[PDB]
Design a binder for this molecule. Structure first.
Ligand SMILES: [Ca+2]
Ligand SMILES: [Ca+2]
Ligand SMILES: [Ca+2]
Ligand SMILES: [Ca+2]
Ligand SMILES: [Ca+2]
Length: 318
C-alpha cells in the first residue's frame, strides 16, 4: 500500500560505482555532485554493497572518507543515507538519549509512528549495537506518565486487527469520556492503556464514536486534558493511528514552516522513510498543506544539501 521514493537500481555494479566514488574524492577537492547523484539513486542495500566493494578495492572506509571530504548538512545527509536501514532508527534513538540532554521530540516521533513489528527490530538492532537495552535507556532518561506511555509502546504489544466489536467500541469511547472531560483532573492511566494497547482498526472506530458522544475530537480533549510531553506523545499516537504518513507529512511541514528549518528532522524523516512510505507522505503533504513537499524543501534548503534532498524526495507536484 505504501510507497517510498528510492528503489533498487537496475544496472547495479557495486564495483563500478565504488570506482566513481574514489575519483570523486581523489586529489584536491571533491566532486560532491558525482557523490550525491550516485548515492540518491541506489537503495540502502545497494549503498552497503558499494561501501563493501570500495573497501576491498582500496582498503579505505567509504564513510570515513566521505566524512573527511564533505561538510555541513550535506555531510550529515550523506552519512545518514549510508546508515544501514535496520540500524538508523536505533541510531537516531541512541543519539536522542545519550548526553546531558534527551531529545524527547525524537523519542516521541519514532516510538509513536513505528509499528510493533518495527519496534521489535529496532529494539534488537539497538541492543546488538550499543550493548544496552532500549527500554532501560528510555526509562532512565524520562519520567512521569510520558515515560509510562513510551514503555507501553516499546512492548510492541498492540492488539491485532480483528473484526470490530461495537459494544467494545462503545465501552472504550465512554471510558475515555469518563476518564477526561467528565472528570476533575485526568485518569491518564486509562488513556495510556486504551491508546497504547488496542488495535489500530478498533481505535479508529473509537475516535469517531468518541466524537459522536462528546462533541469533541479525541485530539481536542487530549489538548484540554493534558500538557507537556505526554500531550505531544498522545497526540503523536492518535495522529499515527489515523495515518502514519499524514502524521509524518505534518512533522516535516512544521520542521520547515517555521522560520528557518529543523534540518535534523528533515534529514531523519526523508531518509528513514525513503524506502517505506515517502511517496504517501508526499501525497498527504499536498492535500493538507497545499504545496508539494518538493516546492517546500526547495525553498528552505540549498547547496548540494538541497539537491540531494530534492533528488531523494522528488515529485514536483507533490
Ligand atoms: Ca579530496
Ligand atoms: Ca567534515
Ligand atoms: Ca478532566
Ligand atoms: Ca495542553
Ligand atoms: Ca522556512
Amino acid at each position: 500500500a505504501l510507497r517510498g521514493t528510492v528503489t533498487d537500481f537496475s544496472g547495479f555494479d557495486g564495483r563500478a560505482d565504488a570506482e566513481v566514488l574514489r575519483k570523486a574524492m581523489k586529489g584536491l577537492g571533491t566532486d560532491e555532485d558525482s557523490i550525491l547523484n550516485l548515492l540518491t539513486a541506489r537503495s540502502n542495500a545497494q549503498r552497503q554493497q558499494i561501501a563493501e566493494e570500495f573497501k576491498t578495492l582500496f582498503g579505505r572506509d567509504l564513510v570515513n572518507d566521505m566524512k573527511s571530504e564533505l561538510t555541513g548538512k550535506f555531510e550529515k545527509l550523506i552519512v545518514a543515507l549510508m546508515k544501514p536501514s535496520r540500524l538508523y532508527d536505533a541510531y537516531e534513538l541512541k543519539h536522542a538519549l545519550k548526553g546531558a540532554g534527551t531529545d524527547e521530540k525524537v523519542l516521541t516521533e519514532i516510538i509513536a509512528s513505528r509499528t510493533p513489528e518495527e519496534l521489535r527490530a529496532i529494539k534488537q538492532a539497538y541492543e546488538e549495537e550499543y550493548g544496552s537495552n532500549l527500554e532501560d535507556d528510555v526509562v532512565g532518561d524520562t519520567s512521569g506518565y510520558y515515560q509510562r506511555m513510551l514503555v507501553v509502546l516499546l512492548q510492541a504489544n498492540r492488539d491485532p486487527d480483528t473484526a470490530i466489536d461495537d459494544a467494545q467500541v462503545e465501552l472504550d469511547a465512554q471510558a475515555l469520556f469518563q476518564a477526561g472531560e467528565l472528570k476533575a483532573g485526568t485518569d491518564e492511566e486509562k488513556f495510556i492503556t486504551i491508546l497504547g494497547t488496542r488495535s489500530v482498526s478498533h481505535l479508529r472506530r473509537v475516535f469517531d464514536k468518541y466524537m459522536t458522544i462528546s462533541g469533541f475530537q479525541i485530539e481536542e480533549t487530549i489538548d484540554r486534558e493534558t500538557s507537556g510531553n505526554l500531550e505531544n506523545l498522545l497526540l503523536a499516537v492518535v495522529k499515527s493511528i489515523r495515518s502514519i504518513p499524514a502524521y509524518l507529512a505534518e512533522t516535516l511541514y512544521y520542521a520547515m514552516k517555521g522560520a528557518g528549518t529543523d534540518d535534523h528532522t528533515l534529514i531523519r524523516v526523508i531518509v528513514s522513510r525513503s524506502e517505506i512510505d515517502l511517496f504517501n507522505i508526499r501525497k498527504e503533504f499536498r492535500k493538507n498543506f497545499a504545496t508539494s513537499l518538493y516546492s517546500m524543501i526547495k525553498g528552505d534548503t540549498s547547496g548540494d544539501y538541497k539537491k540531494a534532498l530534492l533528488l531523494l524526495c522528488g515529485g514536483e507536484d507533490d
